C-alpha cells in the first residue's frame, strides 16, 4: 500500500582531530539504498542495494556533489550552533537532519517533512502544510527568522511534493522485486519453565517485510497486554526483520493463552497456541 | 534523490 523515501544525515564535531564526521543514508520504506561517509576513502555516494546500481554515471556524480554540499553545510551549522548556544570549542556536539516524502496506495503525494536536531533534542521542523516552521527555543527562532526571509519552505515544498515523489515512484518500479515484495512472518511458539509454579511462553515472528507488525496476547478471548515482554523489532541482517512477545503463565494452563499476529503479507491474521 | 542544499542555520 503506502510507501516512503527518507534521507537521514548525522554530523559530529571532533575538535582538534580533523573535520567533523558526516554520515548520510537514504531509505525507501525499510530498505536502505545509498550512503556517504566523510571518513571513507571513496568520497562518493555509494550504493547499498542491488536495484539502485543500474543508475548511470550521471546519477552518482550528481548525488556525490549534493551530499558533499550537505556535508560542508552541516559543518558550518555546528560552528553556527556552538555560537548560538554559547558553548566551548573543545566540546563535541551532534547535528541530525531528516527529510523525505510519503505516498499512498495510488502513489500520489500523501505528506512531506523536514526536521533538524541538535544534541538529541528537536531544533527546528517544517510543519505539515510545508509553509511554516516550529521553533523549539531562542536559537531556533534565529534560524526561523533567516529561513522565512530566504523563502526556504517554498523551495522545500516544491521538492517534497514534486521531485521527491517522482524519484520515489521511479525507485519503486526499478526495485520492484525488492521494494514491492511482502514476505510473511514464519512464526512459532516456545515453552520454558521458570520454576515449579511459573512457565514462560514466547511467540516468535521471523523473516518478514516490512517491519510493521503486531504481536499481542489474549487470555481466552480477552486481551491482557499488561505482563507481555515485548522487544524492539530487530533486523535479521538480510533485509527481513524479527520480533517476539513473551508471557508468564501458571504450569498447566498454556493452552488457555493464544498469540495473535498481524502483518501485510498475511492474508488473515495468524492465531498461535502451545502445540 | 537528494535536493541541492547549501542553506545554513
Amino acid at each position, epitope marked *: 500500500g503506502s510507501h516512503s523515501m527518507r534521507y537521514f544525515f548525522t554530523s559530529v564535531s571532533r575538535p582538534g582531530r580533523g573535520e567533523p564526521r558526516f554520515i548520510a543514508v537514504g531509505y525507501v520504506d525499510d530498505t536502505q539504498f545509498v550512503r556517504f561517509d566523510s571518513d571513507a576513502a571513496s568520497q562518493r555516494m555509494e550504493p547499498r542495494a542491488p536495484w539502485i546500481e543500474q543508475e548511470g554515471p550521471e546519477y552518482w556524480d550528481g548525488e556525490t*556533489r549534493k551530499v*558533499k*554540499a550537505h556535508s*560542508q*553545510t552541516h559543518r*558550518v551549522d555546528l560552528g553556527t550552533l556552538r555560537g548560538y548556544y554559547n558553548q566551548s570549542e573543545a566540546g563535541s556536539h551532534t547535528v541530525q537532519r531528516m527529510y523525505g516524502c510519503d505516498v499512498g496506495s495510488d502513489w500520489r503525494f500523501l505528506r512531506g517533512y523536514h526536521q533538524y536536531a541538535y544534541d538529541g533534542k528537536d531544533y527546528i521542523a517544517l510543519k505539515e502544510d510545508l509553509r511554516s516552521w516550529t521553533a523549539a527555543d531562542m536559537a531556533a527562532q534565529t534560524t526561523k527568522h*533567516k529561513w522565512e*526571509a*530566504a*523563502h*526556504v519552505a*517554498e*523551495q522545500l515544498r*516544491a521538492y517534497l511534493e*514534486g521531485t521527491c515523489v517522482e524519484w520515489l515512484r521511479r525507485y519503486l518500479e526499478n526495485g520492484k522485486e525488492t521494494l514491492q515484495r511482502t514476505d510473511a512472518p514464519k512464526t512459532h511458539m516456545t515453552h520454558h519453565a521458570v520454576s515449579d509454579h511459573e512457565a514462560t511462553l514466547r511467540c516468535w515472528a521471523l523473516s518478514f517485510y516490512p517491519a510493521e507488525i503486531t504481536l499481542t496476547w489474549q487470555r481466552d478471548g480477552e486481551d491482557q497486554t499488561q505482563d507481555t515482554e515485548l522487544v524492539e523489532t530487530r533486523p535479521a541482517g538480510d533485509g527481513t526483520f524479527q520480533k517476539w512477545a513473551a508471557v508468564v503463565v501458571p504450569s498447566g494452563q498454556e493452552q488457555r493463552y493464544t498469540c495473535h499476529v498481524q502483518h501485510e503479507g498475511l492474508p488473515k491474521p495468524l492465531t498461535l497456541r502451545w502445540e | 534523490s537528494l535536493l*541541492m*542544499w*547549501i*542553506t*545554513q542555520v
Partner: T-cell receptor
Amino acid sequence: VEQNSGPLSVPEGAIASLNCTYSDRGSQSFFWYRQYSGKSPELIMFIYSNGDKEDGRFTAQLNKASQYVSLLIRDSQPSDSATYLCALTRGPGNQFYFGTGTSLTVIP
Amino acid sequence: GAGVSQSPRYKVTKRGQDVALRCDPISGHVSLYWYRQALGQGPEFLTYFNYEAQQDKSGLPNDRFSAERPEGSISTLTIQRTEQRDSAMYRCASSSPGGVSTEAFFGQGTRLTVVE
C-alpha cells in the same frame, strides 16, 4: 534561457519593452541585469512572485504559467542605453543562467 | 572582501603559453561561478563551485580548460596551451552568503587576448 533578438531602438521619454522566455519551469528566482559598454553587469531588479513588480521607472513582470519574464522601462532616458540581460536560477546551490541579451539604445 | 575582485584586469598572452585567471569572491559566499563573454553576446556558462567542490565541468569548452577553488574561497581558472579563439572577457561571480539565495555579484572581469 532564450532572450529576444537585439538590437532595440527607443525614443527618449518612451516606454521600452524587454522580454525573455525560458524552458525550465522549475526556475525559482529571476533577475534583470544591466551591462554598460565595457562594464560589468549590475542588477536592476529581482522577482520570484507572479505579476508585476515596480521600482521607480522600471517595472518587471513574471508569468510562470506562460514561462516568461519582462522589463518595462518607463520614460526612458539616454542613460538607460545598455545591453539588458535576463537571468535565472533553479535555486541556491544550482547553476545561474543568463539570456543572450538585448542591446537597447535610447535615441536622444 | 567588500565586492568581488578579479585579477588581472587585462592580459596579453603568446599563443601556446598557459594562463591563470584569479577570482577573489565576497567573504562567506558559498557559490562561485565562472563565465566567458564574447564581443556583443551574453555570458556563456563555464563552471561553478559550491564551497570547495567544482560542480559540473560540462560547460568548460575543452580539456585544456580547468578550474579549482581549493580552500573554498579564491578560485583560479587555468587555460593551458592558449589559442587565438580562447580570447574573451572572462567574468566570475559569487552568491549565497550563508547559503540563502541572492543575486550573482560580478567581478570587474579579465580581458584575455591571445596574440600569435
